[PDB]
């Protein structure tokens, strides 16, 4: 699956002017556009070569949408101090994420339209794209207004139509980067433990996309219970990496196998120490 997501952040800083307002656009968790109100020329900007192709009409449209958004966020930050009875002196944050996950055939899997205030859930459109979850009494006030306004219906139209169609476009103009499959390259390190034991860590490097399955096996069964790992993480060059470790006895390294599966491998990799 592929996703188009817009991560919006407004941070108030009372006495140092207007809230800092940022939008960041991602196709499949790689950045392709940004708008920052603190830029010398606050404008929607390209962050990947493949989006540059778009017309002046595109950038001016997006710039104005961001500007409009910045205004709405200013008003909402003020509404929140009222709902939560807070001083106009403190710094607060609103965050909004909106976008679409699409299957390889191009049918929508999941739309998102959700908000958090001060890092806590505020209101979120359910997967039915009809229904709001309001985390608190403040957000119930908003939910009442949005139900009356037909907000969900309008948000759903963007999630089902515009979002999906633009994603489909982005994937093609960007396919060289976005549809690539960089395969993982794997190795195993060996650390003797003070307890007389051995840590075996299986590393997967250089892979794209992010999705991967990394496991440890002994006699054909997985070691899912006693496995240490790290979450998949970016490696500075648009690729990803991950590792997974197990503790094993001193002679028995050779009887343990690391298994890696990824779109860019014809066949799973199997490695030992």
């Amino acid at each position: 699956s592929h996703s188009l997501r817009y991560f919006v952040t407004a941070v108030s800083r009372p006495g140092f002017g207007e809230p800092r307002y940022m939008e960041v656009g991602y196709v499949d968790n790689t950045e392709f556009v940004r708008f920052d109100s603190d830029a010398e020329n606050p404008r929607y900007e390209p962050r990947a070569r493949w989006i540059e192709q778009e017309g002046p009409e595109y950038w001016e449209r997006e710039t104005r949408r961001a500007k409009g958004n910045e205004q709405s966020f200013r008003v909402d930050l003020r509404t929140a101090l009222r709902y939560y009875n807070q001083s106009a002196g403190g710094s607060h944050t609103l965050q909004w994420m909106a976008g679409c996950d699409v299957e390889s055939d191009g049918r929508l899997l999941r739309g998102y339209w959700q908000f958090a205030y001060d890092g806590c859930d505020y209101i979120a459109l359910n997967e039915d794209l009809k229904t709001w979850t309001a985390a608190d009494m403040a957000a119930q006030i908003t939910r009442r207004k949005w139900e009356q306004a037909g907000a969900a219906e309008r948000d759903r139209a963007y999630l089902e139509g515009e979002c999906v169609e633009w994603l489909r476009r982005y994937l093609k103009n960007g396919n060289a980067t976005l549809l690539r499959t960089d395969p993982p390259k794997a190795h195993v390190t060996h650390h003797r433990r003070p307890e007389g034991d051995v840590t075996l860590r299986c590393w997967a490097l250089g892979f794209y996309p992010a999705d991967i399955t990394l496991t440890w096996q002994l006699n054909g069964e997985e070691l899912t219970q006693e496995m240490e790992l790290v979450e998949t993480r970016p490696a500075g060059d648009g690729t990803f990496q991950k590792w997974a470790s197990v503790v094993v006895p001193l002679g028995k390294e050779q009887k343990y196998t690391c298994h890696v599966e990824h779109e860019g491998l014809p066949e799973p990799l199997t490695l030992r120490w």
Binding site: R61, G68, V75, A80, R154, Y158
Partner: peptide, 9 residues
């Protein structure tokens, strides 16, 4: 292209 806010909190 991104989403536009219409309804206020």
């Amino acid at each position: 292209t991104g989403a536009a806010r219409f309804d206020e909190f």
